[PDB]
Structure 1
Amino acid sequence: DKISHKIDIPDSAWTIGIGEKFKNAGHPNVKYPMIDDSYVQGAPLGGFGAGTIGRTYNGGFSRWHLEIGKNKYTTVYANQFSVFQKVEGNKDGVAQVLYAGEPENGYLSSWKWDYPKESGMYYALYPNSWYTYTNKDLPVQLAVKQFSPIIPYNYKETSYPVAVFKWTAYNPTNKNVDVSIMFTWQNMIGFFGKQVNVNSGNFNKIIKDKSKDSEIVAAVMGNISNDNEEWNGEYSIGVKKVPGVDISYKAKFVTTGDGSDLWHEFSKNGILDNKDDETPTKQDGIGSAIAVNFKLQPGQTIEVPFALSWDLPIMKFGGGDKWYKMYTKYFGKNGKNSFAILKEALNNYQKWEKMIDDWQKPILSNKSKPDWYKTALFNELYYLADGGTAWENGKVGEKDKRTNNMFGLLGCFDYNYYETLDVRFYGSFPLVMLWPDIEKQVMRQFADTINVQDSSEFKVGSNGAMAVKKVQGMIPHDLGSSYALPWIKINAYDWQNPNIWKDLNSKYVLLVYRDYVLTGKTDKEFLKYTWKSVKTALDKLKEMDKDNDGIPDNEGIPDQTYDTWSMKGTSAYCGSLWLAALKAAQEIGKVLKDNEAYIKYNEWYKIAQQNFEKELWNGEYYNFDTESDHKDSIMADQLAGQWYADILRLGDILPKDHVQKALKKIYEFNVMKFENGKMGAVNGMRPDGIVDESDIQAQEVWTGVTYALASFMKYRGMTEEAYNTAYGVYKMTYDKSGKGYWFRTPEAWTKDGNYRASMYMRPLSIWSMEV
């Protein structure tokens, strides 16, 4: 490895060998069908709301999130980088696809597949990833840095459907070597969203854009139709000329063929035919190729940038609504703008790299934090782009343009609900901290739903009872499903009835006040906007107190985020959330000078606090609840309200001494007596130190609950416990001794390491550790 020295990969990047097999991968632990795409994954490319593309550590473009809200894992084999190398004075060169694998059928059989093992490495520190190629048969060593411009406090470039591939080539040998790097891409119009005639009308054109000191050559892969539909638009790949490289191209090769139309050119001398051909295809798949060729002298280094863009302006959901994606604000809505996007990337990628470095450097340069923590902190952010992220710039056919751009991030793909609020309580830390204008827009979207009534009915999955879809004054579970109508039909979730949940209204209030505090305690307008909904939310939750202790009663069913685990009476979890929400509402009361609300919630608070303490404090920790069979279970998340109170600077809702004892107990039991403290915090443990078997969820570690708990321990000075707790989640996700969940962190695992719900929003809570 002579190439690593020539580039700058951070030590905290996650690493794996190109072509590495992983032996101990986990699988779903439920009996119903559940996504399991394998451990062959990588950091995604693409902006927020753009559709994302998962290029894996093996090199393949395989995890397709271009259909917003869907996850489609299939390798499009034509999509590759390939290399040609010939030593000066040799008869022939070698040509190799940089993909550790091969097609399943006979298409592209002429290409050289199966990039060998132990010949290069993949590195990721989101939004960057790298590959290095260190192959005994490639005398010139190569590396690529690939990224999209995902940049905190930037809502523009962060939306772009673009990726940059910055290549570095270095010749450590004593002879001149001729080198070519070729990008191939299938015209993927019709890959989704098109019913019939799926390749028909696809065509490819070549753009050559020359100004002084800027030459760009690109392929634009579109369709002859000018229809404005979800399926139609353009892909582009291209390259920017640098000194000492020549560009060649091929407009049209057949992907549903042996590939020799392209490969017979590339494998001769690494130079393509420069043959333009806009002839549209009918049945056959087609693709384009862009190549650079250069001679490297001994000791010489060369850098060349490629890019990929995709202008697919319309997203369609299952309920029938069609929306424009966010980036259309910057480039247009007609689906004929892929070249503009690509050019902007090729001309500005160096600025974008520095903007990324500028936001990563304060964390990376902090020598008090271990590398593993930096690995997790940055790489968990993959989900912001990969979580089916929807970001609208108008409804298709909309008359009056609106001021705001609605946003949604999925809870996950198996439970396909937008902004699942009981989950976003944990998972939304990166948005409030790094993209606060998005965070505030989402919370306003929730404010707007408080008094919505929808008397249409649904069957509650867990019991078979019919229930009302949306009750006035109850915050919704979610803002819809990508299978139905995001932002329009709320409460797509139906396993339980969210209108009787005891955590949603509380969590909503805590999120509102969190978003004011963590953006500098200045946004009174935001508190103004949300105030009526906050009062309504708390007032409705108060009505669910049935024995007048001042606290909502859990109803002996799962009526909160732990939606198969029954709570009954006053629970530590919903009880502490209630207390904190009440105290947050007092403070909003003072800021907005609503002394009536202040007095009201202050008296509710003092009564509930006294009773919470009496009912649940047992001398060592807070009991699970007052009325369940396993009421004395030690719950990892028992003091979630106080966790948030620390972040919101609300002081102590429970006594310092009791919180410390409770946290030490949780570490001693839920962490250290669960698989020797190496897998996070199990949710429920019996006081005899055996895991609570009342429900599956009690026997699960929740990744986002565990990272949040680590945050809580950290604010309370339990530094070792905090990082030891979080480390188990890191280890299971990323480490060789884990279960292979990189770039698909799940909700949960059980003691055997098998998982539930990969690609999950909750573990974004790791960012609470940076408050």
Structure 2
Amino acid sequence: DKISHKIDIPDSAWTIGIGEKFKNAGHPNVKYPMIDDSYVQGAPLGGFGAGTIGRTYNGGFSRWHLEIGKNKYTTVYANQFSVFQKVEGNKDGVAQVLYAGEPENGYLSSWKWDYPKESGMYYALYPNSWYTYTNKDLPVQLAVKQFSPIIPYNYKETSYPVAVFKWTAYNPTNKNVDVSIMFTWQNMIGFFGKQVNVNSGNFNKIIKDKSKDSEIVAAVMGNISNDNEEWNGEYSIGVKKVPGVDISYKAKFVTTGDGSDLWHEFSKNGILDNKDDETPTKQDGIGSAIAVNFKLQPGQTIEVPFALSWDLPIMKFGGGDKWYKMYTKYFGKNGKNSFAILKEALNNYQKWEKMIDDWQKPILSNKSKPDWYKTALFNELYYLADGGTAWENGKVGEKRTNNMFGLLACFDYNYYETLDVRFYGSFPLVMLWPDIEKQVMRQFADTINVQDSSEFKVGSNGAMAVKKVQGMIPHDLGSSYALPWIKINAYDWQNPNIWKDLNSKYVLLVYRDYVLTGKTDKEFLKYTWKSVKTALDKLKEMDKDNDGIPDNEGIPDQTYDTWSMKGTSAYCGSLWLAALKAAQEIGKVLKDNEAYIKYNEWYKIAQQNFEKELWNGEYYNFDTESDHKDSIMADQLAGQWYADILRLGDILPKDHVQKALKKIYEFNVMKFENGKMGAVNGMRPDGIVDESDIQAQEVWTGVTYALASFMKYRGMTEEAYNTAYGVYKMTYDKSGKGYWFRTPEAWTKDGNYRASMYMRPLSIWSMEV
């Protein structure tokens, strides 16, 4: 490997060999169908709300999130980079697709597949990833840096449906070598959203932008229709001319053929026919190819940038609503703007790289923090783009000031903004994109007094329940299969209108968002204040025995939605205490004296009774009435964790908090698989995992990272990082279970998982508070 020295890959990048087989991979541990797309994954490309494309470590464009809210894992084999090299003096050159695999059928059989093992590496530090190609049959070594401009405090470039592929080529040998790099792409209009005639009318055009010193050649792959529908739009690939390279192209090759129409040209001398052809296709799939060719002398390095854009302006959800995607604000809504997007990227990518370096640098340059922590911190952010992210710029046929936003809990449980989960998972938004965060919280504020008296069947018990109760915060803002933002509470496994954590978590999120954006946004507190008071007042009514604390009802009435709580729980009780203290402080800020007094009174009574009911001398009991009420719960003091972040002080005695955290580390971490897999949710006082429910026997990745932040704040530095390390190890390490770029909700002791591609582990960002 002589190419790594010519590029700048951070030491904390996650790494794997191109073509590497992984032997230890985990699988779903449930009986019902659950997504398992394998360990062949990579860091995604594409902005927030743009739809994303997962290009894997083997080189294939395979994990398709272009249909917003959906996950489709299938390799589109025409989409590749390929290389040609010929040493000066030799008769023939060699050509190779940079993909460690081959197609299933005979399409593209003429191409040179099966990029060999031990001939290159993949690296990822989101939003960047890299491939290096160090092949004994390729004398010129190549590397590519690929990224989308995902930039904190930037809501413009961060939305773009674009990727840049910055190539570096170096000749370490003593002979001149002719080199070509070719980008191929299938015209994917009709890949989704089209029931019949899926390729019909697709056509490719070549754009030559010859502005002085900024020459770009691109293919625009669209459809002759000017219809404005979810399926229609354009894809573009292209390249910027640099000194010493020539550009060639082929407008149209057939993807549902042997591919020799293209490959016979490329494999000969790395130069394409430059044949423009706008003839639309009928049944055949078609694609385009953009290539560069150059001669590298001994010791010479050259850099050349390619790009990919996709202008698919409309997202449709299963309930029938069509919305424009956020980036349409910047490029238009007609779906004929892919070149404009591509051109912006090709002309500004160096600026974007610097903007990304500028935001990563404070963390990467901190030599007190281990590399592994940096690996997890940055790579967990993949989910902000890859979580079915929806960000609207108007309903089709509709103008509002704000742009509604939603991130999925996951794909298996296809619910937008699940509030009990976002309590953990929204840290990156408040810390890095706070205008999005506050918009999402205003969305929740607006739902507080919505009433929907129509009934739904509760999955867990078959009982009928009211969809949405006035004064109760919703579980979620809908499903991509139905009507995001419009029909809330798509979740039906339990009835969230009786949950004991949602209303408290809502208040805690509101106050968090004020505190972590500098305690200046009084406007945000004013907007949400009525909903905060309502939320707490309603939850107070669920106190059955006048101890001042809502009563869990002997069912799963909170985020651990198969794990029953009864009476006063440590989890919901501590959240309640903290929410009361937050509301007191908001009351002070807004000069609502009567609110301050009321919530202070409730707080004092509840605090006294919580301590008396649950403090056992070593930790806080799980709850007051369950069969295993004395279980040690990893999340028992979630309210105090948030109180630390919100700077609300002690809600429970410091001595008791420290004892509880030490107990959790000693038991839930260190007695669970030697502390190498995170914190198991429930452990019995005898050091055996609690078997009352499956969720007690799971490590929750987002709970464990949040617990690590709690330990860190409380000075338990070694414990914090050791606790988090197990989650990193399972996700990323060779000894783990192969969950990179699909971190799950949970795993059991065998390492098998539930719900890959999950929002909650974004809570790792709570470690940066």
Q: TM-score, normalised by structure 2?
A: 1.00
Q: Does the residue aligned with 1:739 lie in a helix, a strand or coil?
A: coil
CA deviation string 1:511-541 (max 9, x = no partner): 0000000000000000000000000000000
Equivalent residue in structure 2 for 1:622, among 620, 623, 629: 620
Distance in 1 between residues matched to 2:672 and 2:280, nearest whole Å: 61
Distance in 2 between residues matched to 1:320 and 1:404, nearest whole Å: 22
Distance in 2 between residues matched to 1:494 and 1:760, nearest whole Å: 19
Report the Cα offset of residue 766 of structure 1.
0.1
Distance in 2 between residues matched to 1:467 and 1:195, nearest whole Å: 36
Q: Does the residue aligned with 1:318 lie in a helix, a strand or coil?
A: coil
Report the Cα offset of residue 331 of structure 1.
0.1
Distance in 1 between residues matched to 2:194 and 2:454, nearest whole Å: 32
Identify the residue that residue 759 of structure 2 maps to in structure 1: 761
CA deviation string 1:546-584 (max 9, x = no partner): 000000000000000000000000000000000000000
Report the Cα offset of residue 211 of structure 1.
1.0
Distance in 1 between residues matched to 2:571 and 2:390, nearest whole Å: 31
CA deviation string 1:721-768 (max 9, x = no partner): 000000000000000000000000000000000000000000000000
Distance in 2 between residues matched to 1:402 and 1:352, nearest whole Å: 29
CA deviation string 1:182-208 (max 9, x = no partner): 000000000000010000000000000
Q: Does the residue aligned with 2:394 lie in a helix, a strand or coil?
A: strand
Distance in 1 between residues matched to 2:683 and 2:415, nearest whole Å: 30
Report the Cα offset of residue 62 of structure 1.
0.0
Distance in 1 between residues matched to 2:77 and 2:195, nearest whole Å: 22
Distance in 2 between residues matched to 1:29 and 1:456, nearest whole Å: 35
Report the Cα offset of residue 153 of structure 1.
0.1
CA deviation string 1:679-726 (max 9, x = no partner): 000000000000000000000000000000000000000000000000
Distance in 2 between residues matched to 1:387 and 1:105, nearest whole Å: 31
Report the Cα offset of residue 611 of structure 1.
0.1
Report the Cα offset of residue 245 of structure 1.
0.1
Report the Cα offset of residue 662 of structure 1.
0.1
1:668 equivalent to 2:666? Answer yes
Report the Cα offset of residue 430 of structure 1.
0.0
Distance in 2 between residues matched to 1:559 and 1:638, nearest whole Å: 15
Identify the residue that residue 310 of structure 2 maps to in structure 1: 310
Identify the residue that residue 382 of structure 2 maps to in structure 1: 382
Distance in 1 between residues matched to 2:73 and 2:768, nearest whole Å: 33
Report the Cα offset of residue 604 of structure 1.
0.1
Distance in 2 between residues matched to 1:393 and 1:584, nearest whole Å: 33
Q: Does the residue aligned with 2:492 lie in a helix, a strand or coil?
A: coil
Distance in 2 between residues matched to 1:246 and 1:686, nearest whole Å: 69
Report the Cα offset of residue 341 of structure 1.
0.1
Unaligned 5+ residue runs, structure 2? Answer: none
Distance in 2 between residues matched to 1:267 and 1:614, nearest whole Å: 78
Distance in 2 between residues matched to 1:596 and 1:337, nearest whole Å: 55
Q: Does the residue aligned with 1:319 lie in a helix, a strand or coil?
A: coil
Identify the residue that residue 190 of structure 2 maps to in structure 1: 190
Distance in 2 between residues matched to 1:336 and 1:454, nearest whole Å: 41
Distance in 2 between residues matched to 1:221 and 1:422, nearest whole Å: 42
Q: Does the residue aligned with 1:540 lie in a helix, a strand or coil?
A: helix
Q: Does the residue aligned with 1:15 lie in a helix, a strand or coil?
A: strand
Identify the residue that residue 684 of structure 1 maps to in structure 2: 682
Q: Does the residue aligned with 1:211 lie in a helix, a strand or coil?
A: coil
Report the Cα offset of residue 587 of structure 1.
0.2
Distance in 1 between residues matched to 2:464 and 2:59, nearest whole Å: 49
Report the Cα offset of residue 5 of structure 1.
0.3
Q: Does the residue aligned with 1:33 lie in a helix, a strand or coil?
A: coil
CA deviation string 1:161-189 (max 9, x = no partner): 00000000000000000000000000000
Distance in 2 between residues matched to 1:158 and 1:211, nearest whole Å: 26
Q: Does the residue aligned with 2:180 lie in a helix, a strand or coil?
A: strand
Report the Cα offset of residue 337 of structure 1.
0.1
Q: Does the residue aligned with 1:357 lie in a helix, a strand or coil?
A: helix
CA deviation string 1:454-498 (max 9, x = no partner): 011110000000100000000000000000000000000000000
Report the Cα offset of residue 657 of structure 1.
0.0
Distance in 1 between residues matched to 2:142 and 2:454, nearest whole Å: 60
Distance in 2 between residues matched to 1:405 and 1:194, nearest whole Å: 27
CA deviation string 1:136-159 (max 9, x = no partner): 000000000000000000000000
Identify the residue that residue 600 of structure 2 maps to in structure 1: 602
Give the share of equivalent positions with the same residue, in percent: 100
Distance in 1 between residues matched to 2:79 and 2:352, nearest whole Å: 24
Distance in 2 between residues matched to 1:467 and 1:552, nearest whole Å: 20
Distance in 1 between residues matched to 2:446 and 2:560, nearest whole Å: 26
Distance in 2 between residues matched to 1:283 and 1:95, nearest whole Å: 29
Identify the residue that residue 643 of structure 1 maps to in structure 2: 641
Distance in 1 between residues matched to 2:489 and 2:453, nearest whole Å: 12
Q: Does the residue aligned with 1:214 lie in a helix, a strand or coil?
A: coil
Report the Cα offset of residue 395 of structure 1.
0.1
Identify the residue that residue 78 of structure 1 maps to in structure 2: 78
Q: Does the residue aligned with 2:431 lie in a helix, a strand or coil?
A: helix
Distance in 1 between residues matched to 2:241 and 2:435, nearest whole Å: 38
CA deviation string 1:366-412 (max 9, x = no partner): 000000000000000000000000000000000xx000000000000
Q: Does the residue aligned with 2:706 lie in a helix, a strand or coil?
A: helix
Report the Cα offset of residue 265 of structure 1.
0.1
Distance in 2 between residues matched to 1:486 and 1:630, nearest whole Å: 39
CA deviation string 1:18-51 (max 9, x = no partner): 0000001000000000000000000000000000
Identify the residue that residue 44 of structure 2 maps to in structure 1: 44
Distance in 1 between residues matched to 2:454 and 2:177, nearest whole Å: 71
Distance in 2 between residues matched to 1:214 and 1:574, nearest whole Å: 60
Q: Does the residue aligned with 2:586 lie in a helix, a strand or coil?
A: helix
Report the Cα offset of residue 297 of structure 1.
0.2
**4+ residue runs over 6 A deviation:** none
Report the Cα offset of residue 542 of structure 1.
0.1
Distance in 1 between residues matched to 2:513 and 2:280, nearest whole Å: 52
Distance in 2 between residues matched to 1:466 and 1:125, nearest whole Å: 47
Distance in 1 between residues matched to 2:493 and 2:229, nearest whole Å: 34
Q: Does the residue aligned with 2:629 lie in a helix, a strand or coil?
A: coil
Q: Does the residue aligned with 2:489 lie in a helix, a strand or coil?
A: coil
Equivalent residue in structure 1 for 2:438, among 416, 440, 444: 440
Distance in 2 between residues matched to 1:744 and 1:578, nearest whole Å: 32
Distance in 1 between residues matched to 2:193 and 2:486, nearest whole Å: 21
Distance in 1 between residues matched to 2:111 and 2:455, nearest whole Å: 56
Distance in 1 between residues matched to 2:586 and 2:230, nearest whole Å: 43
Identify the residue that residue 717 of structure 1 maps to in structure 2: 715
Distance in 2 between residues matched to 1:17 and 1:454, nearest whole Å: 53
Distance in 2 between residues matched to 1:457 and 1:41, nearest whole Å: 41
Q: Does the residue aligned with 1:237 lie in a helix, a strand or coil?
A: strand
What are the within-5 Å matches in structure 2 for residues 290-329 of structure 1?
A: 290-329=290-329
Distance in 2 between residues matched to 1:14 and 1:500, nearest whole Å: 42
Identify the residue that residue 159 of structure 1 maps to in structure 2: 159
Distance in 2 between residues matched to 1:454 and 1:330, nearest whole Å: 37
Report the Cα offset of residue 667 of structure 1.
0.1
Q: Does the residue aligned with 2:215 lie in a helix, a strand or coil?
A: strand
Could you say what the CA RMSD is over the residues aligned between the two structures, in angstroms?
0.2
Unaligned 5+ residue runs, structure 1? Answer: none
Distance in 2 between residues matched to 1:288 and 1:21, nearest whole Å: 31
Q: TM-score, normalised by structure 1?
A: 1.00
Identify the residue that residue 168 of structure 2 maps to in structure 1: 168
Distance in 2 between residues matched to 1:641 and 1:259, nearest whole Å: 60
Report the Cα offset of residue 614 of structure 1.
0.0
- How many correspondences in the alignment? 769
Distance in 2 between residues matched to 1:339 and 1:494, nearest whole Å: 43
Distance in 2 between residues matched to 1:383 and 1:435, nearest whole Å: 14
Distance in 2 between residues matched to 1:81 and 1:268, nearest whole Å: 17
Q: Does the residue aligned with 1:725 lie in a helix, a strand or coil?
A: helix
Report the Cα offset of residue 678 of structure 1.
0.1
Distance in 2 between residues matched to 1:207 and 1:267, nearest whole Å: 24
Distance in 2 between residues matched to 1:563 and 1:49, nearest whole Å: 29
